[PDB]
Amino acid sequence: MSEAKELIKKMCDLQNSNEEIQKEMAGWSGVVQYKLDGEEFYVEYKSDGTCEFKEGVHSSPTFTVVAPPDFWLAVLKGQEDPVSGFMMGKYRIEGNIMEAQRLAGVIKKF
Amino acid sequence: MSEAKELIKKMCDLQNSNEEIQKEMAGWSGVVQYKLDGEEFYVEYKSDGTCEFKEGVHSSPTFTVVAPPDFWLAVLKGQEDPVSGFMMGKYRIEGNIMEAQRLAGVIKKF
């Protein structure tokens, strides 16, 4: 495993055993697909704040993070920022269903 | 104004005068740009659950909804669904900063 992948897996383990992280994560559901120099893995995020780390490619992810592994590691360690990094084009993102879901939620309320 | 645009403006007015809608909307911040057959307008969503409807094009929207106006009207009235509609390609969405923001939020917690 790349260091980034190893660390994502570690974060999932911490999340799944830590009630406080789960509370903070609760309320959102999605699958985040990673592709780091062709290394494929994903994290299923459940509304109860738990998650599942899986190998390979999920059939319909919420979005895919296509990032060089050394950059993503730096991000995971807080040496780079996903937002400014994205604004600079230091990685890319595929998929817009999350925006569709947001629009649906807003309109639902009226 | 298209009927869809008129209705979005009405929804913003209701949101801004209705404490309950504001409570339900609170906690998220973004600008949603609309482009409906070239008709341009946007809604600024603030974390306190209020909003601002504006004419024209905002310089850096969270995302842009590029939709035919009659379809979007049908969506706003609940005759079509933004999620299934998006899955079918009945409209499109430009921008992924919201995903970058989501990634940042998850990583922040570790």
Automatic annotation (TrEMBL), chains A, B:
Record-linked Pfam families: SCP2
InterPro entries per the UniProt record, alphabetical: SCP2_sterol-bd_dom (IPR003033), SCP2_sterol-bd_dom_sf (IPR036527)
Domain (SCP2): residue spans on this chain: 9-108
TM stretches of this protein: none
Protein origin, superkingdom: Archaea
Protein name, entry field: SCP2 domain-containing protein
Organism, scientific name: Archaeoglobus fulgidus (strain ATCC 49558 / DSM 4304 / JCM 9628 / NBRC 100126 / VC-16)
